[PDB]
Each structure stands twice: as structure tokens, then as C-alpha cells.
User: Which sequence fits this backbone?
């Protein structure tokens, strides 16, 4: 028993991390099948980042301006291409350690494991969620750009995130591996507004089911509610609206526990209105929204 | 920002095997032609109520230990019991053996757990050895033989092997020489963990981490002494702070310009007044699962 914020094992992704240098700037790249993916801002100086014209900056570069290192070993770049905000560096040798992989664009509220890297070297692994405002609350210091986020379904690594930017507020922004930003953000050093963050309601409910499964049951109350009634309370506390899709996703957890989804929503409502009154749930004094329903099931089933 | 961060698990992934003996299956650690696993792999459910491990091990031969590493079967050519671990000598050295050590850690130290089922990696998370020598992990039925480790760099220091869930739902285990952390035994019986306490030095480190990240509301106008603070500490079931702990916080004191005893005065006020519904680094309670080395490392980017 017990319940932990757990990352996927990182070994498959460790073998894909390289260093990418271009003039002054050094950061991380992802080496799969003779292509190296990294943030296009590797071509920028500090001054460039204030207002980059990426086409004009990339024109001053050739293949030989991109230094790609894996351990001690240099890779020869034989091709460079810009796809949205990622650079694709075609190299002469396929990564012998390429895993089975996909590129996925995830939805707000989905979770993934980050492997935080500096100079192409793994530092650490942690789990986080794409927030409803398309930011993440990671841990990323100055050389961490090009660090990747991923899920493993089994054997296959689904890469969903590449780190690009820290906002002035100290939250993080980045792309999928086709180089499209999650959210409204751009790879420019300017004031950029993250919108209102909201809590991922379906995840909170999943985590409450996780609590019940692990014996934490005090918050099960005597009430029920409707979907509209609950969502009325949800909007007041900046919780995401719960839909029938979300009720369907919670079904297995409902079945395992014998606690109906709308009964669990009634419990959540009371916690919203009354707080936790100095108690904890799974050792947390706040409501956790970083577990999906699939994460809870997986952890409890032992995927 | 600031996150509970595990070590990358790749080096340890290549050491995980499945060990089967009669009915029971669990995880083992393959280094240099030896497989380490929990000796309770030889037990049935009935045996676990009152095991005589010597007498149970006598009924076993090398061929009764099925060791699988991925698809590859390993031939066992030797078995021995060291404390509560079984050492299975196999015919092949693990080609993926990393540089490694076996370390017995102190209460309050942290490590990364790679949770494994049937010799396969499930997931990685960071936790702390509690002052009462338990941990609050995530461990389901086949998780025994899962390991805890630190990486200093290139070298993997194995500190923990999972053996037991207690009736209270906390976890217990050994070092890699098979000695239990704490008073526990590998027997399905009522076993008392003592009073758990908070790891004071870790809380202070995490407050320094907070200040570094811009969370500063809890900085107050007081100072205190070591004995005065420890008087408050014992009331709240916090570990006593010593000069060793003050010395280890020195670099964080230097970085922030907040003297250690000034930070202890802040903590005292949080202890006495609670948090008044506020948060620090996104936690509404005091976090004791980061060491001083962990905070520095995360902030420096090792």
C-alpha cells in the first residue's frame, strides 16, 4: 500500500540526451534515429532573445555551426531544419539507444515525467501536470532547456514536452516535439501573461479515490450532489468544470471503491467549503491535482 | 522552482531481476555475478507467520531459485544467507553493473526508490528514512526486493532493500548487507515502530530553499538559542538540532544571508502559530523530505 508521486523509469530517455552548442549558448537535445531535436533559441544570444527574428538568425548558421556531443563523442550534423520552435539537426549516425517512441500533444490536466538535464547530462526525474493555463511548475535552472517530458505505455516512450522558457513569474513553458508551444507563449524574452490557473477537478477526484483505496476515508461525508450543483461550487473556487467525459473516466475507480462519482463530488464540495480543518489526506494538507485517473489506477494496479 | 526530485534510474534499471522460489516471486539486484534479494522469497504465506529461515533454506538447492533478467534465464551456482538477504551466485556477471557501493544511511537521509514488480521497473520516487527507521513508500504485493539508492556521480550507493509492510501501512527494509533499519524483523507479526519525529535540519533546509525561490513571508524579526529552540522542538516532536546540523546548513546560511539561528526563530513561530492557511513552496505543511545536500544540489544543478 501507500501512495507516492511517481515518475516513469528514465533509463530509456537517459540514452537519448545530448549536448547542443551553437556559438555561445549550450543546452540539451534529444537524439532519436539520426535526428537531434532541441529549442531553436540555442541560436540566440541574450540580446537576440529580446526580439529574435529566427529565420534571419538561422540563415547566418550552417551545419558546422551546430556542435552536438553525446558523452565525449561528437556527432556530425549533415542537415538542419526549423519546425515551429524546434531545431531538427540531421546527424550521420542513428542513436543505437533509440527506444520505441512517439510524439504526442497532451491535453491540459494530463501528467508526465520530466528528466531535468544540464549540458546533456541527467540531473533528476520528477512528475508534473500540464496546468489548465498550459504552464508547468517544474524545477529548471539556466542550462535546462531541451529537457523533455514523456510517458511510457510500455516499451514505447511517448514524448510530449520540451522545455524552452521560464516566465517572469517563475513558471515554465515549452513545446511538443513538433515545436508547437503549449499555450499562448512564444520563445522571446518579454513579459508574457499566463492566465488564471485553475485546479484540475477530475484529478482531485482521482486522488480522493486513491486516498480511499489506501485507507484515508474521514472525508467521506453524508451528502450527495448533482453535476450542475457541484460545478456551481467548482467555478467559485477556480476548479475546472466536471463533464460527463470526466465521470466516465472515473468509472473504474467508482467500481473498485463502491463510491459513486457524484458522492465523491459531494465530499469534494464539503472540503472546498470547510477546508480540511487541520487534517491531511495522503499526507497532504492541500488537495492534490497532479494525479490523473489513469495514474491512480496504474499505480494501484502496478503497471 | 522547487520539486521533489529522484535520481535518474537507468543505472539501477539494468540491475533488476525476477527471483522465483516455489510459489513466491519478487525482485532481486544483479551486480557482478551475485543476485541479492529478500530471504523471505523462500517463505509461503503460512511460513511468514513464524519463519525459521535456516530450516527453510536447508530444504532449498541452487536449482530451486529461478532467476530471470528480461528474457534471459540465469543459472544459480551458489546460495547463501547474509542476515535477512539471500545472495544467489550466478554463472554470468551483469554486463550492466555500474560503479556501486553499499551504504548504511542515517535516519533523516533521503534516497530514490525504483519500485519494481516481477523484476520490471514500475516507477521512481524520492523519500526519507524516518527517525523511527520506517519509510512511507508505495509498495504493492510483489514489490519486495525493490531498492533505494543515491548517485554521487557515476557511482550508485545502494542503501535500501524493501522487505515488509507493517500493520500500520508503513514500510521497513534492510541495507544491502541484510541488516534491518530499525527494530524490525522479516516476520508477519505486530511490530511497534516508535514515535516518529520531524527531521528538523531538513525542514530548515527547505525553508532556505523557499527563501531562495522568493517565498519569504515567514521570515520574522526574532532570533533564538540552540537550547531555547530545542525546548520548542521537543514539544512539537521535532528532532533536536545540534551544531553538526548548524554546520551543514552553513552554505545555505551564506547564500541567503540568514543566520541559522534566525531561521530557527522563524521555524519556532511557524510551530507555535501554525501556517494560518498559507503555503511555502506550494505545501501547506512543513516539508522534512529534503536534506541540506538535496537543496544545494537541486539549486546548483548537479
Assistant:
Amino acid at each position: 500500500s501507500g501512495f507516492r508521486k511517481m515518475a516513469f523509469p528514465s533509463g530509456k530517455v537517459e540514452g537519448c540526451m545530448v549536448q547542443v552548442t551553437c556559438g555561445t549558448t549550450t543546452l540539451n537535445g534529444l537524439w532519436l534515429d539520426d535526428v537531434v531535436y532541441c529549442p531553436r533559441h540555442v541560436i540566440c544570444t541574450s540580446e537576440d532573445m529580446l526580439n529574435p527574428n529566427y529565420e534571419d538568425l538561422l540563415i547566418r548558421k550552417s551545419n558546422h555551426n551546430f556542435l552536438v556531443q553525446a558523452g565525449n563523442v561528437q556527432l556530425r550534423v549533415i542537415g538542419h531544419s526549423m519546425q515551429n520552435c524546434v531545431l531538427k539537426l540531421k546527424v550521420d549516425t542513428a542513436n543505437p539507444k533509440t527506444p520505441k517512441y512517439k510524439f504526442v500533444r497532451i491535453q491540459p490536466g494530463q501528467t508526465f515525467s520530466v528528466l531535468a538535464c544540464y549540458n546533456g547530462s541527467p540531473s533528476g526525474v520528477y512528475q508534473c501536470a500540464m496546468r489548465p493555463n498550459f504552464t508547468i511548475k517544474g524545477s529548471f535552472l539556466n542550462g535546462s532547456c531541451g529537457s523533455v517530458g514523456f510517458n511510457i505505455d510500455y516499451d514505447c516512450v511517448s514524448f510530449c514536452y520540451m522545455h524552452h522558457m521560464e516566465l517572469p513569474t517563475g513558471v515554465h513553458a515549452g513545446t511538443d516535439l513538433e515545436g508547437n508551444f503549449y499555450g499562448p507563449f512564444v520563445d522571446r524574452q518579454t513579459a508574457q501573461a499566463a492566465g488564471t490557473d485553475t485546479t484540475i477537478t477530475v484529478n482531485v477526484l482521482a486522488w480522493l479515490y486513491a486516498a480511499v483505496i489506501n485507507g484515508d476515508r474521514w472525508f467521506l461525508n453524508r451528502f450527495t450532489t448533482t453535476l450542475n450543483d457541484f460545478n456551481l461550487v467548482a467555478m467559485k473556487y477556480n476548479y475546472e468544470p466536471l463533464t460527463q467525459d470526466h465521470v466516465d473516466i472515473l468509472g473504474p475507480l467508482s467500481a473498485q471503491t463502491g463510491i459513486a462519482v457524484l458522492d465523491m463530488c459531494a465530499s469534494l464540495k464539503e472540503l472546498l467549503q470547510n477546508g480540511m480543518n487541520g487534517r491531511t489526506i495522503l499526507g497532504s494538507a492541500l488537495l492534490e491535482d497532479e494525479f490523473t485517473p489513469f495514474d491512480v489506477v496504474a499505480q494501484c494496479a502496478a503497471a
Q: What stands out?
A: The domain at 201-301 of chain A is CATH 1.10.1840.10 (main proteinase (3clpro) structure, domain 3).
